[PDB]
Symmetry: C2
Subunit: 249 residues, 2 copies
């Protein structure tokens, strides 16, 4: 069953997955897609016409998730929902992404996580919603110049343009690009211990020093570098922005 | 001290405040402004050149606030800040607004509340930032036709147009107008008892039934009437919108 793959596809497939069993190929969009058993795990892999491997999706159990991911889920808005399926997704030149499919009553959500438990996105479940992501030349050029060591996890389209989700020395960084892929901003959560001394002293000498710290983000944009302290009091949240001298802006 | 008011301003002032002591007039923008002792509290009143009364700002103590307002402050993000000043503000053809000025370290905030303790707005304190609000014909017409029972409390400009804050039959409502003052939406908070039964049954049979309800708001716009349930779990918030049929949209 399924179709006969082109020889370069068959060759790339057999070279990458020598232990594959019961492979079944089909054409979906611009890719040769193969469902198969690999070391007892149901796997799907995507290849281009020329046999270039682009992605794999592996069926895993909840117990096979890294601790950081299972903990992220357990601490999430959806922790009480029933987990239906869990997957590991590897795309060409991208870091690993874990997918948890969860349901409750008449709703079903697809949760995508970094290996460190960073929620990349949450979407309504739909069948066949996971496919290859071609990295545009503009994005590879930007990564080489500005984020040389980082590893992309996802490229998402939004109204303002594109979002790059990446891991940079285990930091989950989100960069916004406009519709022409021109960089606009980068933001990430940091630990209080990592905030520069001058900024941290500003915060500790400010009105907000006694408030509960919910999170701290660095924000980089055309205007410079900023530190966003999200603090709370009586269950109300406020985000206070500090500049590089530790002054409130 | 100060300047001599035009005779129509002087007469309007004496007629409206017969017991005023130590009045001092100045001109500020398009208005004659007078500072005076009114029955033991400092008060400021604004008049047009023609002597039309536009506003008064009355110095009050925290104890003179309606209970709802002082309670709103004590439950706010700023409950721990030091109260520097409190005022009651009455503007022509508008309902009463209470202002609380609070400070901590080198920050100061101005909190404006309805008589029921609804936060109208919160802004960084700035000297003499309270001034008359000329109600445009478009807004007066809209209040007469569409919100005939309501008292307007504030008109606030925003990027999408204008925001009208009002009290309509003891419900605090916020209406959004576009830049031509054309109505876009109206929203207000409600209790579960006030929500239509079909909508509550929809929520109670949905995936979000077991989550904690933080608030429920009705939203009216060109496309219909909606119910926004802001719920939480593991400290994470999500707003679920239901239509008049009790279905999630
Ligand atoms: Ca400083
Ligand atoms: Ca229904
Ligand atoms: Cl979440
Ligand atoms: Cl960076
Ligand atoms: Cl420093
Ligand atoms: Cl401060
Ligand atoms: Cl809190
Ligand atoms: Cl209404
Ligand atoms: Cl919660």
């Amino acid at each position: 069953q399924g179709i006969i793959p082109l020889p370069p596809v068959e060759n790339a497939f057999q070279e990458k997955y020598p232990d594959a069993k019961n492979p079944v190929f089909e054409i979906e969009g611009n890719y040769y897609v193969v469902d198969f058993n690999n070391g007892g795990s149901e796997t799907t892999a995507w290849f281009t016409d020329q046999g270039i491997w682009m992605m794999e999706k592996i069926d895993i159990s909840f117990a096979q998730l890294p601790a950081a991911v299972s903990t992220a889920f357990k601490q999430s808005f959806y922790s009480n929902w029933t987990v239906d399926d869990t997957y590991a997704i590897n795309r060409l030149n991208m870091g690993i992404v874990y997918k948890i499919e969860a349901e409750q009553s008449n709703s079903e959500v697809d949760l995508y996580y970094s290996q460190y438990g960073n929620l990349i996105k949450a979407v309504d479940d739909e069948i066949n919603n996971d496919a290859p992501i071609v990295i545009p030349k503009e994005v590879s050029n930007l990564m080489e110049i500005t984020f040389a060591n980082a590893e992309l996890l996802d490229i998402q389209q939004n109204s303002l343009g594109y979002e790059l989700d990446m891991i940079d020395n285990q930091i989950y960084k989100v960069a916004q690009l406009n519709k022409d892929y021109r960089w606009q901003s980068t933001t990430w959560a940091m630990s209080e211990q990592e905030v520069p001394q001058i900024v941290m002293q500003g915060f500790e000498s400010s009105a907000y020093a006694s408030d509960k710290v919910q999170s701290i983000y660095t924000l980089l944009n055309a205007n410079g570098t900023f530190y966003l302290f999200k603090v709370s009091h009586n269950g109300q949240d406020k985000t206070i922005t500090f500049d590089v001298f530790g002054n409130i802006v």
